[PDB]
Amino acid sequence: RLSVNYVKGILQPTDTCDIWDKIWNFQAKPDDLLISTYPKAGTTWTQEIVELIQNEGDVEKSKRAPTHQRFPFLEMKIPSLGSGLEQAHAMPSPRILKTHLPFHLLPPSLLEKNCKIIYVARNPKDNMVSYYHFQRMNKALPAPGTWEEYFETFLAGKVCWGSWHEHVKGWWEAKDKHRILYLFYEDMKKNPKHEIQKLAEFIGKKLDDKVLDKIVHYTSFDVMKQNPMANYSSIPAEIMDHSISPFMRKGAVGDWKKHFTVAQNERFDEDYKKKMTRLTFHFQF
Amino acid sequence: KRLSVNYVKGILQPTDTCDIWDKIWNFQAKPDDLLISTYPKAGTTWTQEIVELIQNEGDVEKSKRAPTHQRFPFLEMKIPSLGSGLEQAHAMPSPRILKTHLPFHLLPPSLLEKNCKIIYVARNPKDNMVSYYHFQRMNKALPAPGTWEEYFETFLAGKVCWGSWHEHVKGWWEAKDKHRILYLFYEDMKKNPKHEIQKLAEFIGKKLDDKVLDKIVHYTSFDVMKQNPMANYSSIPAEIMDHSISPFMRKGAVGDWKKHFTVAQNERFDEDYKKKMTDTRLTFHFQF
Ligand SMILES: Nc1ncnc2c1ncn2[C@@H]1O[C@H](COP(=O)(O)O)[C@@H](OP(=O)(O)O)[C@H]1O
Ligand SMILES: Nc1ncnc2c1ncn2[C@@H]1O[C@H](COP(=O)(O)O)[C@@H](OP(=O)(O)O)[C@H]1O
Ligand SMILES: Oc1c(Cl)c(Cl)c(Cl)c(Cl)c1Cl
Ligand SMILES: Oc1c(Cl)c(Cl)c(Cl)c(Cl)c1Cl
Ligand SMILES: Oc1c(Cl)c(Cl)c(Cl)c(Cl)c1Cl
């Protein structure tokens, strides 16, 4: 596995730590769209939707290259994948950018330029489960240990990008005074058309029902799982082993119930209440 | 090596194919017999220890004379190298303190005809399931439990020795209305041991002073009994029980099930439980 270290208080792959100053001083464009998420909150889904909205349903164009090549992952720097920062550097407008950075670590240019930001939050228990399996299959990230160990690791924020709680909280507090659309993975799953419409309005695109319906179809889990440009199948096998756990794993809400013991659930809820707001009303515990 | 299990009168038993049921059913009780009755793992060993110390007014010496299984005849038991509970009962001087796991409808009628005092102990089914799971892992007289996920469904289905937990606790709860049964709960015993000891003493008919009550509370605590070689099942042939797999005195805690059940298992359990428990007020009693 690739090594990780602390940069500005959060675990990151070693190569990200080494280029922090470069990341911090990222140069945004006023017309950049930023997709911001805690890892495994629904980044790939949201990116696919946002591009399809921007290109008005042009499914052929979204198949031009895989997700990681289409969308610069700002803080990412991994051997065989290059630097997301430099991917963006070279890229002409309109850019659709990705980050998992907690809000306090966000390159200030993105705020200075008042870029439209889409933040997606996900139920933390499903988020833990998704991140657990991701660490099992992704060798750029630390070994997760046993489920029992990982539960504690996640709870304490000792995973890359830090505390889930701090992450969702900082971004929620930020939405009040910045150009942020704050969405929930669960709302997207329950009524994708409604959330896609909300996205389009925020992006400033008027779409008719036909195109909206088309985006709902192409961005459904069962369709995206089969799309070799959207399912992370194109990542070198030396980094992501889909036979351990596929990137497009389940795409469901409530998978956490199959993983959490009642004891873990009670400990999680107790811990949550201590760390955590109106944000709480948007999750089902 | 695991011992074969067989159906006897509709329930699995850790016993051979030579049917000796009639002898058990025709067991000859005495009016001063005390009976401790439990679903497997509901708190038999604990209750026996309390009951004898009450009967002997706190005489801990007497209770150390031999281990649990030799002090207390296990009526339906017939296991290679363990002998026969029936023969052990026949040989046991009065006043006997007897043990059974039989569901109420299979109870030898002499225990009823003689109006014997019976102490039944129920335990919440989730902790009961977990306790029985680990007991089957360690105890070679019982079936191999399979995986935890398999055993969960086996237990839910009542396909374990002594049958359905649900039917067991319900039958005994209904029985208490017509027969001389003191119906106790493991969780009450754990939460206020002194209170349940006083209740038992009054039922058995012993007027114990405060010092004796406190003494029994001390000696029947999990931590003390766990270290007591006459009360912890250490003396069972190593070929029957392997305590290195799981000790008989495992945790002695209410809510240990929470470390075993996933939330999904819990929801499946709770729905199953509702469907099986609509006709009993027992449910207003179980603590988890
Ligand atoms: N179209 C879609 N609908 C719902 N979930 C999707 C999706 N595409 C990807 N996902 C899920 O979102 C998670 C990945 O998030 P990210 O893109 O932020 O890394 C995975 O969750 P699971 O591991 O629960 O399946 C993945 O299956
Ligand atoms: N003094 C005591 N206090 C609480 N629990 C006790 C106890 N003595 C034994 N037990 C528990 O009762 C269960 C055994 O029941 P039985 O005697 O009917 O076979 C075991 O539960 P656990 O497996 O949950 O530890 C055992 O640890
Ligand atoms: O979201 C991602 C994270 Cl957190 C890592 Cl570490 C990697 Cl390698 C990839 Cl590809 C994605 Cl998509
Ligand atoms: O309660 C018991 C049961 Cl059910 C069996 Cl099968 C055995 Cl072998 C023993 Cl020792 C006890 Cl205590
Ligand atoms: O002998 C004992 C008596 Cl009588 C009491 Cl009351 C208590 Cl609490 C303890 Cl610990 C012992 Cl050892």
Side-chain angles (χ1 to χ4, degrees), chain A residues 1 3-13 15-20 22-59 61-172 174-200 202-204 206-209 211-237 239-269 271-283 285, chain B residues 1-60 62-63 65-86 88-112 114-139 141-206 208-225 228-250 252-283 285-288:
Chain A
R1 283 169 186 274
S3 189
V4 310
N5 194 26
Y6 280 93
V7 67
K8 303 282 162 188
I10 62 164
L11 283 165
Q12 290 287 278
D15 312 302
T16 291
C17 296
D18 299 338
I19 68 157
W20 182 247
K22 293 186 185 176
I23 297 160
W24 182 253
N25 293 285
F26 174 68
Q27 182 80 5
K29 301 173 174 283
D31 77 334
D32 282 343
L33 298 178
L34 176 67
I35 294 147
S36 177
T37 51
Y38 194 67
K40 317 315 297 173
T43 319
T44 306
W45 189 10
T46 303
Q47 289 170 306
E48 196 71 12
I49 293 170
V50 168
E51 186 169 75
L52 284 178
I53 291 171
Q54 169 176 96
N55 73 23
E56 301 173 39
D58 193 342
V59 164
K61 178 162 269 301
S62 287
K63 295 217 161 50
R64 77 192 177 279
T67 308
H68 72 283
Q69 285 179 5
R70 288 183 276 151
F71 309 114
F73 184 2
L74 296 179
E75 66 266 36
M76 182 281 299
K77 201 192 166 181
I78 304 167
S80 85
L81 302 181
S83 148
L85 191 62
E86 283 309 312
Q87 273 183 255
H89 191 189
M91 194 179 205
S93 149
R95 308 189 292 192
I96 303 170
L97 305 169
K98 163 190 176 168
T99 188
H100 300 313
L101 293 168
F103 184 79
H104 59 106
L105 299 178
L106 189 75
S109 180
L110 292 156
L111 302 178
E112 283 158 5
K113 299 279 176 287
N114 196 48
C115 300
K116 288 184 281 295
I117 304 167
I118 301 102
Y119 186 82
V120 189
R122 181 174 191 191
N123 171 283
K125 300 172 185 180
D126 285 335
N127 203 146
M128 180 190 293
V129 167
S130 193
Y131 207 173
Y132 169 66
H133 292 295
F134 195 53
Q135 294 193 216
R136 293 182 51 242
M137 69 85 75
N138 185 347
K139 307 296 150 55
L141 297 164
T146 62
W147 167 253
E148 296 74 31
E149 281 161 351
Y150 192 76
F151 171 90
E152 288 298 316
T153 300
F154 187 101
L155 197 76
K158 292 177 171 174
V159 290
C160 295
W161 288 277
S163 164
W164 173 89
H165 305 79
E166 285 177 9
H167 200 285
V168 299
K169 201 164 40 182
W171 280 100
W172 178 259
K175 86 189 206 288
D176 298 332
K177 62 168 295 138
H178 297 98
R179 198 179 198 195
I180 300 167
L181 182 67
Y182 201 111
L183 306 178
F184 298 89
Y185 179 95
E186 296 76 22
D187 291 358
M188 295 167 69
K189 192 76 195 185
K190 186 173 177 183
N191 191 340
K193 189 168 177 179
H194 180 79
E195 300 306 309
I196 288 163
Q197 284 177 234
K198 290 170 49 182
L199 273 159
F202 180 66
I203 293 175
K206 297 191 277 295
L207 301 176
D208 74 340
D209 266 323
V211 170
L212 292 175
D213 288 344
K214 179 186 188 183
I215 304 184
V216 171
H217 175 75
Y218 279 95
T219 65
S220 62
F221 178 82
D222 293 337
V223 176
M224 289 187 59
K225 178 156 183 59
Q226 300 308 315
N227 177 347
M229 295 307 180
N231 63 1
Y232 278 81
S233 62
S234 66
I235 291 296
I239 302 170
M240 288 186 186
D241 184 343
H242 295 267
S243 80
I244 298 307
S245 190
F247 187 103
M248 304 298 294
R249 190 187 59 95
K250 280 192 211 181
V253 295
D255 195 49
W256 71 267
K257 294 180 170 191
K258 294 173 161 166
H259 295 76
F260 272 58
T261 63
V262 172
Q264 287 176 326
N265 198 40
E266 289 183 6
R267 180 163 164 69
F268 186 98
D269 289 349
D271 180 77
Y272 181 96
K273 290 182 188 289
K274 291 168 186 174
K275 292 161 175 176
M276 307 287 278
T277 184
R278 286 173 265 231
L279 172 61
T280 300
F281 301 123
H282 289 92
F283 305 121
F285 294 82
Chain B
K1 198 273 172 173
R2 275 182 198 270
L3 293 78
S4 70
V5 293
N6 289 289
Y7 278 103
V8 179
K9 299 290 298 196
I11 60 171
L12 293 165
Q13 294 287 273
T15 203
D16 62 43
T17 64
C18 186
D19 195 70
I20 58 144
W21 176 249
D22 291 348
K23 294 180 172 294
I24 294 164
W25 177 261
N26 291 127
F27 172 72
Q28 298 148 127
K30 295 162 171 207
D32 64 344
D33 284 341
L34 300 183
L35 172 70
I36 289 94
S37 180
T38 50
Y39 187 73
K41 313 321 289 174
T44 321
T45 305
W46 188 13
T47 303
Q48 288 170 301
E49 199 68 9
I50 300 163
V51 169
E52 187 175 68
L53 291 174
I54 296 175
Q55 187 60 36
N56 294 329
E57 306 181 30
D59 189 344
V60 299
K62 210 167 200 327
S63 293
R65 74 186 180 281
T68 308
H69 70 281
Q70 296 182 352
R71 283 186 274 147
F72 311 115
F74 181 177
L75 298 177
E76 65 268 34
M77 185 277 296
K78 185 188 84 190
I79 295 174
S81 75
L82 287 184
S84 165
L86 211 52
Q88 287 170 32
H90 287 163
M92 182 69 64
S94 295
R96 305 181 288 197
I97 304 170
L98 308 171
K99 157 173 169 180
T100 192
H101 298 316
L102 295 163
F104 187 75
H105 69 283
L106 300 181
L107 193 71
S110 182
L111 292 156
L112 307 174
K114 297 311 193 272
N115 196 40
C116 306
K117 296 173 165 154
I118 302 169
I119 306 87
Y120 186 83
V121 181
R123 180 177 194 187
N124 84 69
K126 305 182 179 175
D127 280 322
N128 207 143
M129 179 192 285
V130 169
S131 188
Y132 205 172
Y133 172 60
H134 292 296
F135 191 52
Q136 291 194 215
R137 292 179 59 233
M138 68 87 78
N139 180 347
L142 291 170
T147 64
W148 165 247
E149 294 76 23
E150 279 164 355
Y151 190 75
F152 175 94
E153 288 299 322
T154 300
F155 183 102
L156 224 63
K159 297 188 188 159
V160 294
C161 292
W162 286 276
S164 160
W165 173 90
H166 307 81
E167 282 310 299
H168 202 284
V169 293
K170 286 165 60 187
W172 279 95
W173 182 255
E174 173 174 52
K176 80 189 189 312
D177 297 341
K178 286 216 198 297
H179 303 288
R180 193 179 204 189
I181 297 157
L182 181 66
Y183 198 110
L184 302 179
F185 294 88
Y186 180 95
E187 291 78 18
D188 290 340
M189 292 168 73
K190 189 81 197 179
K191 192 91 206 318
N192 199 335
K194 187 170 177 172
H195 182 76
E196 303 304 309
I197 288 160
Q198 295 174 288
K199 181 187 291 188
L200 270 157
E202 191 50 27
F203 181 69
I204 294 165
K206 293 283 183 156
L208 305 186
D209 99 297
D210 210 48
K211 300 196 286 308
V212 172
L213 292 168
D214 287 350
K215 176 179 189 181
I216 302 181
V217 174
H218 166 70
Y219 280 98
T220 63
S221 71
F222 180 76
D223 292 345
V224 171
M225 290 190 62
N228 180 347
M230 291 310 183
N232 61 8
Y233 278 77
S234 52
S235 73
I236 289 296
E239 310 80 53
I240 308 280
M241 289 184 190
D242 186 347
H243 293 72
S244 76
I245 299 175
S246 186
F248 187 99
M249 311 292 289
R250 195 184 57 94
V254 177
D256 187 67
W257 71 269
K258 290 177 179 191
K259 290 171 197 175
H260 292 80
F261 275 50
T262 62
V263 166
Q265 283 178 322
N266 199 46
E267 295 186 356
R268 184 182 171 356
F269 186 96
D270 284 347
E271 185 161 346
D272 184 69
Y273 182 92
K274 293 185 204 179
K275 297 191 181 295
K276 291 177 185 172
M277 303 292 275
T278 60
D279 59 344
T280 182
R281 283 189 73 76
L282 199 39
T283 60
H285 295 255
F286 287 117
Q287 281 133 9
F288 289 90

